Amino acid sequence: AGLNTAAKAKGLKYFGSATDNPELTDSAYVAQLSNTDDFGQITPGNSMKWDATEPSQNSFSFANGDAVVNLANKNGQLMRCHTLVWHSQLPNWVSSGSWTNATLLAAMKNHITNVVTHYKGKCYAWDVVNEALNEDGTFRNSVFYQIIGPAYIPIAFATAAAADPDVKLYYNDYNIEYSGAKATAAQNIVKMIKAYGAKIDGVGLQAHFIVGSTPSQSDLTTVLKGYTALGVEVAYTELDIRMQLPSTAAKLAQQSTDFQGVAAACVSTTGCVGVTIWDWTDKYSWVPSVFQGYGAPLPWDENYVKKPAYDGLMAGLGA
Ligand SMILES: O[C@@H]1[C@@H](O)[C@H](O[C@@H]2CO[C@H](O)[C@H](O)[C@H]2O)OC[C@H]1O
Ligand SMILES: *[C@@H]1O[C@H](CO)[C@@H](O)[C@H](O)[C@H]1NC(C)=O
Secondary structure, eight states: OOHHHHHTTTTOOOOEEEEOGGGGGGGHHHHHOTTTTTTTTEEEEETTTTHHHHHBBTTOOHHHHHHHHHHHHTTEEEEEEEEEEEEESSOHHHEEEEEEEHHHHHHHHHHHHHHHHHHHTTTTTTEHHHHHHTTTTTTTOOHHHHHHOOTTTHHHHHHHHHHSSSEEEEEEEEESSSHHHHHHHHHHHHHHHHHHOOOOEEEEEEEEEEOOOOOOOOHHHHHHHHHHTTOOEEEEEEEEEEEEESSOOOHHHHHHHHHHHHHHHHHHHEEEEEEESSBBBBOOOOOOHHTTEEESSBBBBSSSSOOOHOOOOOOOOTT
């Protein structure tokens, strides 16, 4: 019947989509987001980030995050919860602070404990740390790395696990889906977390790809299995395949094969639990505001009509 029914028939836990709170007032949008043939899982694109949830220190705010959970609960959809520790979308008090290791650690741990406890029981997975790596596999020089050093990563995981021992704890990043220094360094993050004694359950592969320049099915699968070999699960967490505009029939067809290989890579790898696309309609994609000249990245167009990529995904899921 749809992406989620097809995914589950192949043993995946879900096919799902991100969304954001302004979109939930569009009734036609909501109807399709709520179609559980296509979506069995929801990620909040923004309302669980640090700026949204802890706008002042020790002053938490959950209305917007909770509204997305409420919609998923209404529909019987799973949640992925996104994201606890990240260098972007920090409130001013974090980025402007004069910190020591002890005072930033206390603020970081408090952030994690409060947000995870609030959502205890409500999330399939958390993206506990997001985008901790440079492209060469060194650590990104965020405020957390500058002040705390590499230990911020396992400390974040351990803190989340203490607050909610049941939820799957993920490391999430982009450009870790293809073979290379960054992917290898993501494997090393998994190893480091476990060497500290902290828990890590999954690797989240953002999968912000480019039409005609998407990793091949074979490389995607080698990379997925490089993580599942480590005793973790994997998921594609933010899948979109941006095209260099303008859109054409030929580009739409290439986009379909590109999406097909992603889905098929996941099915081929036991331990790949699911795919989430980063929203579902071109109308609401983040891409054009960030990648000048690119767009049309998703399986439905800006009029909410399926594109060839929808069929590519179904074919990769063996439906
Ligand atoms: O802010 C980051 C973006 O920088 C990140 O951009 C990458 C860059 O490397 C790639 O071309 C990949 O396709 C893009 O997504 O994307 C995630 C975002 O949070
Ligand atoms: C910060 O302190 C924790 C001990 O609580 C430690 O694991 C970490 O390595 C320290 N980092 C720095 C730069 O001192």
